[PDB]
Structure formats: structure tokens, C-alpha cells
């Protein structure tokens, strides 16, 4: 409620989610972000080239953004499952081998690149992890935390590595770490998590709602979520969770993603042409289902340069409050706003936005 980012329907509601590893945002970049949104999550690595640690880079960025826009809610990225190297916290975790997660054989559980995965069932680890979040948001200038990697924690394949007993303890540990985060950071801070996910094999809607404020739909229209069935499931879950009072962040992709090699090799001007042509469909999907506290992100990745500071005239046009609920006819969706009429067909991937 009162701790949410200040929401408006005046124009398309926008959020940001990115990092600039090479330094703080320039004056122009910070002015752009702070003026055009009240809601940004700063990624791992942000400003580490000049500030050393992600914690120091994010803290300095939060201060400069809030000097520009005191209503900007700045969210600290803190992965719930993975021990990334570019945080001061990494060399703290390195000193607590009693916490480290192992497979049934006693081998350390690490992703490729010697990236340890956390044993959420360990209470001492959880106290430390939530302390890192509290340092960033209570003592520091951020307004909340972005808890990534829930689908990885829940993956049934982890049972093979850990055994069933440890798997269940880790799933309970996720419940406990979310609760303990809320207790340590307070009721006026935001908990954003990743997230809502719809694939043919595995799906997750908004969860942990007594504690979490916001969920990302990270894969909208892309990855294993491009089918009409999974798109409809994502849009309907946005509608449902936001009608129930939650924040939903729909991550649109600008016709390609950061793992699409041929697309990522194209000259920037061509990427921009693709991004312009690719906007209407996901924007219409977002507007079809959007409710209060729903935000759109649109780009091709999570580094600043991946389209994150591009802009489009659609984001400047009067939108206004919805004047009716989303209407569905099979794969076709429509929505009426005070200053716009939205139509999208998930089966043909056609869309129309009539601005007025």
C-alpha cells in the first residue's frame, strides 16, 4: 500500500531493471531514469568498475537517483540462491564453509564457473543473507530487495542432487528466508521477486503473498513462454495478482533477447529498428491486462546498453485510467482506456493500439 512506488495511468507505467557495470549513471542517464519512472531495480555489478562492490555502487546510485526524484523506489538485487562474486558479501560467505551446500556425495553444489548455490535450510546462512539485504535497505538508501532465482530453487531436478529430505528442507528454507527478510527489513520496504513463469512443463503464479509485494514476469513472450497458451497464462496472472493488490512487473523483450546471438550481433541502429517494430505486440499484451501497480519494462537485456534507455513515443502519449475491464474472446483480448483502445490477438501475434 503506502510503501508502493507512486503509480499513475497518465502514460504507460514504466519500470527499469538493469545494471551499468562500468560506473554510475552519467548525469544524463540518471536524469533520464529518475524523470521517467518511480521504480528501478539495479543489477549485480552496478558501478563495480569504479566502486568495487555492487553494494557500494548501488548505494551511490540510489543516492544520486533519489536526489533527482525523491519518490523513486530503488531496489537492491540480491540473489536468493547464487553466490555471485561481485559483492562484498561474496568474500564473507567464503568464510563460512559450515553453511555450504553439498550434493549427496559431499561435492560442493556449484554452477559452472564455481558459482556456489545456497543451502536455504541453514538458519545461520539465512540470518547472514537477510542481514546483507537489511544493510542495503535499512542502513542504506535502497527501498527494497529483488529476490531472484525462485524457479531454480524449486526445480525438481535438484532432488537428484540433494535427495528428497534436503530438497524439502530447502523449499521450507525459501519460505523461511522470505519471512525473515520481511521481519528484518520492515513493513515499509519492498520485496520484489522473480517470479511469475509460464512454460509448457512448469508454471508458477504469484506466491508468498503475505510477505512479497511484487513479482516479475521475466520471460513474457520469449524463451519457453512464447506460446499463446503461456502468454495468456502470464497476462491472466498479472490481472489476477494486481487485482488482489500486488505489484506486477512485465518484462517485455524487443523482438529478441540477450542470448539470441545473431540478433545481438546486429548494429545498434538495426537493433533499434527491430525494437521499434517489435514494441506494439508486448505493449498491447501488457495494456490488455494491466491494472493498478503494473509496470512495463521493454528492452533486449539487463546491461544498460541492451536497449534499456531507449524511448518510444508510445510511452509519451496520453493513456489515462482504464474505463472497462479486459475482454477476452478466445485468444483475442481488448481493453478500453480513457485515451486509448487496445486490441491483441495472441494466436496471430497481431495488435492494434488506437490512441486518442
From TrEMBL:
Pfam families hit by this protein: GHL15 (PF14885)
InterPro entries named in the record: Aldolase_TIM, GH, GHL15, TAT_signal
UniProt cross-references to PROSITE patterns, sorted A to Z: TAT
The protein's name: Glycoside-hydrolase family GH114 TIM-barrel domain-containing protein
Species of origin: Stieleria marina
Upper lineage: Bacteria, Pseudomonadati, Planctomycetota, Planctomycetia, Pirellulales
